[PDB]
Amino acid sequence: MAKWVCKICGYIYDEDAGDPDNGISPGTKFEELPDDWVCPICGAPKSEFEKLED
Template sequence: MIPRDPDSGIAPGTPWEAVPDDWVCPVCGAGRADFSIVT
């Protein structure tokens, strides 16, 4: 999944590593630490 959250300044295609540690999902409210990369 490629994060995209224009309201937080995260554009489509932003690498996960570039998402700020304090980012919160606007859909479910989970923090960045609650997600993991699935390959």
């Protein structure tokens, strides 16, 4: 699945990993993260992530 970078801090939101410590099961697409989900490292909103693909 896809990987996304937090443009602020470099954390990778890896769809295959999810973010279980913050309520997101492995395999959750970035689109499906709640609107108010934030980078678990720096607190940046979803807007600040970029999809790692051409």
